Design a protein around this ligand. Sequence first.
Ligand SMILES: [Cl-]
Length: 259
Amino acid sequence: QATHKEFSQLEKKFDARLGVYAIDTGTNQTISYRSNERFAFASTYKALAAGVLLQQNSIDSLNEVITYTKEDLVDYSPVTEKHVDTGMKLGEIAEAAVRSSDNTAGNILFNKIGGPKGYEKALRHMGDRITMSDRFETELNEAIPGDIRDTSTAKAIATNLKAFTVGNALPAEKRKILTEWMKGNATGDKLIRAGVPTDWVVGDKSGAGSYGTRNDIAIVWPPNRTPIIIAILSSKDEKEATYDNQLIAEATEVIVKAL
Ligand SMILES: [Cl-]
């Protein structure tokens, strides 16, 4: 509640709508701003869908070779486009989705958990009544305001990310695989990672979509402290609106100061 003025000032400085939910897993203190408003989740689902994949499949089964065609390649598939003729190991596809945001890898991940419907079913089983998953990449980025397809809230997303990365949604060995996939990726450098102090460590998953949608979700580790789970979502009124990574980094600075 104390941070509401700071977040509203960021909305004005960046002409955007901002959704924030952060929870300190050691104290249960939360920071929330518009945390119940819907945004298109865009590529942030890839971290959670990787969690669902790990929950439903053994570590050894990540060695299965999955194949696809040139026709299957959707926009922004920098890893999968290099391996059409040979296929890739399932674990490498999941890693490509989380690390590089490869969209064809995201669709294969969807396929392996039952499509958008299967992803939604898995989240409902974890107690998430909010997230709505309907479409594959790249149509899921359409982000029409008022259209609930492929949307969630900062609170719902953060709660799911907490379950997978710190909670009891996964066994410890798979939790480690997921958090490692989330660490050290360039797609996160200008977002939450840019807004935390230099002695903090961030494992994140970024997202971007239409209507200026720009998101980042993360598990962050301060020094000598329990992790903090952060979801920052943002969007704008106009379909062709730009986004500004600095909004997410600035929102992160407010969270850091409060926590
Ligand atoms: Cl709200």
